[PDB]
Design a protein around this ligand. Sequence first.
Ligand SMILES: Nc1nc(=O)c2ncn([C@@H]3O[C@@H]4COP(=O)(O)O[C@H]5[C@@H](O)[C@H](n6cnc7c(N)ncnc76)O[C@@H]5COP(=O)(O)O[C@@H]3[C@@H]4O)c2[nH]1
Lengths: 188, 190
Amino acid sequence: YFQGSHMVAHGLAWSYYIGYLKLILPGLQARIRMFNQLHNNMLSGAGSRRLYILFPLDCGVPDDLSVADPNIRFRDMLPQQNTDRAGVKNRAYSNSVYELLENGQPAGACILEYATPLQTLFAMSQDGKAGFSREDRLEQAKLFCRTLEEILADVPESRNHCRLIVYQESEEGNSFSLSQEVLRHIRQ
Amino acid sequence: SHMVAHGLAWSYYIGYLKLILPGLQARIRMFNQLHNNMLSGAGSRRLYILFPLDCGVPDDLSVADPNIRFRDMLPQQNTDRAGVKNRAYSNSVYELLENGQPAGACILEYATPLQTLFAMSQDGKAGFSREDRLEQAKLFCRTLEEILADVPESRNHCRLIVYQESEEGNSFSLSQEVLRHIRQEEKEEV
Ligand SMILES: Nc1nc(=O)c2ncn([C@@H]3O[C@@H]4COP(=O)(O)O[C@H]5[C@@H](O)[C@H](n6cnc7c(N)ncnc76)O[C@@H]5COP(=O)(O)O[C@@H]3[C@@H]4O)c2[nH]1
C-alpha cells in the first residue's frame, strides 16, 4: 500500500473544513449564548460549549442519534446561521443539542453530530460504480480523520471548538456506551 | 477510484442531489402557486447547476452577471441528517435578463465542491497545483455525469452547465450561457 497524495479522504477533509467548519466556527459561541438565554444556561461550562463530532470509523451513520444510544436524547436546536453560498441565498447551517442520560436523568448536555462525509464513504462502498471496497473505506475514514486533525490544528484558539470523538464500532464491545464516551469527553 | 474528484462527485450526489431532486417538483409547484407560474417548461423541472472549470465561485450570482437577478427562494426542504435535526435544504430562483427585461427564470446555483478545489489550490498545505485543480474539476464533472446517467430520476431533474471562462473568453455572458441551455430544451418540448 502506498498512500496516494490526493485521495478521496483528503478532499473530504478539506471539504468539511472549508465548506462547514470554517463557516460556522466564528459564530458558534454567539449561537450558544443565545441558546443559554432560552434554556437557563444549559450549556454551562466550556466542556459543554464545544462542537462534538462523532467519527465512527466503520462509517455507520444513522440520522437519529438515539439509534446509536438511547441515552442520547434530543433537546433543541441552536439558533441557525444563514449565509449566502455559491448562489444559494440564505443557506442554513444548523446544530442540535442533546441531553445525555444516566439512570434516566440528564447528566450533561452538548452539541453533537456525526461527520457527514462518513456517509459519502459508506455510500461509495455500497455502489459498484464507485469501485470502492470495505477495506478502502476504512483506510479512507482513518485518513479523513488524520487530515482533518491536521487542518484543525491551525485554527486560532478563539475558534478551537471542534472536538472529534473517534471510535471503531467493530472494535469496541457490547459494553461500549456512546453517551458515556461523550460524557467522558465533556468531562475532560 | 481514488482521486479527490471522485469523492467530491459522490459527496455531491449522495449528500445533496439524491436528497433533494425527488422533492423538487413539488417544491416548484408550490413556488409557482405563490409566484404566478414564474417557472415553466424545464425550468419547472430542473435544478440548473453551474460548473466553472476555473473554480471561480462567487457567492452572489449578480456579481458574476448583473443580468442574473434573484427573485425568491423555493420553499425549503427539512430533513434529519447525521444527527442534525431538521437540516435545511434551500434553493434560489433567478430571472435572466436580456436587453433589460426577463427572458427566462430558473433555479440556479454553483456546484459548491468547486469551492473546495479552489481552496485546496490556494493553501500550500494541500499540496495541490492549479494544474491539478483543473484536471480534478473536469473529472468531478465527468464523474457526476456518469453517476447521473444511471439514475433517470435524478438526471431528469438537473442540468449541468459546464464552461471554462478564459477559454470563452471574450464576449462571455453567464446569463447567455444559461439561456442557451434553457432554449435548447424548450425547442424539444411540447
Ligand atoms: N453537518 C453539515 N451540516 C451542513 O449544514 C453542512 N454543509 C456542508 N457540510 C458538509 O461539509 C462539506 C462541504 O459541504 P459543501 O457545501 O462544500 O458540499 C456539499 C454541497 O455542495 C451540497 N449541499 C449539502 N447541503 C446543501 C445545501 N443545504 N444547499 C446547497 N448545497 C448543499 O452537497 C455537498 C455534500 O454535502 P454533505 O455530505 O452534507 O457534506 C458536507 C461536505 O462534506 C455540512 N455538514
